[PDB]
Amino acid sequence: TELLKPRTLADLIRILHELFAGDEVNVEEVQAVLEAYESNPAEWALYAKFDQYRYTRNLVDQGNGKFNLMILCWGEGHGSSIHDHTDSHCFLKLLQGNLKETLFDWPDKKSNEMIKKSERTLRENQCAYINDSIGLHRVENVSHTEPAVSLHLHSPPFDTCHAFDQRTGHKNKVTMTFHSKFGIRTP
Template identity: 60%
Template sequence: MPKDLKELIQKLREIFQDDHINVDEVRELMESYRSNPEDWKKYAMFDKQGYTRNLVDEVKGKFNLIVLCWGKGHGSPIHDHSKSDCFMKMLQGELKETQFDWPKEEGREMTEKSHSTLKNNSVAYIHNKIGLHRVENVSHTECAVSLHLYSHPAQTCKVFDQCTGHIAEHELTFWSIDGKRTPKKTTASKENN
């Protein structure tokens, strides 16, 4: 069991030296890390406009590790994960994950498959073969923080309109890198709307 976030990163880097990744091994490692705000508080940067993606560590072409900060009532759109495996660990608070089937055709409401509540230290996993999902902080009194590991990180993702199944491509950006705010863009980040 990693004693802190730094050791978790070290163990992830060891696992990702191989080209083939064992999903169960990565999930078990993510589950074994116990959230400690002292480990991740430097990455926990919030924005009133929407959730933030804060890069903690990356190995080009292998993985990126991101702290996502969810203000009260913030949520993601329904989205895919390109060719990435996505592991999501709760560090603080709770998030609601709703999974959807891929739309069969545009113009129809998307079908909800399941929903679950992710609590502190729990880990969820999703890949495009499983389906699509939306993640939300449904609390209007508490913020939430989650740690996401994307194996084969993507530069873009597809987002979906729940009512029509309409698909749009969105660029994935970081609100901060290694605890330092990235330069603000002149237009609002589409992924946080």
């Protein structure tokens, strides 16, 4: 239970394997360790594979089945849908640039516009946390000049989620696709 500062991305991954060795998740400890890793671009360049038209999801580690650790690459103006996290934990740490996170409440079953609950700017090396009990969110790189890179941890791993239509609250099931795995492009 003794949290040391991760010296490198590899060290962080080793620490995460220790923190997820059991059946439950100490959220504050995981967030603290992710926050404490100082982004070093040389260590994650292998995973930072961008696409011109949308953000990419790049698998880094499968956590011995306990978590998916992935790097997301956001071109200028790239953003996500409003989405949930499939009854799992989601941690989001900025490795480069800034992302805007907008929080939404779960919609009522009547068709209505989803109104933002709040928003914040996540800055380099900050780590955010979300789960379905907190709400829904959208993540966006609103920069016109700076690509963003973020490090995401999902526990347990999940490969589907729901996207929500901001005008109605209607949801559709979406399959999560990986742009690359362990540095290898996976078309």
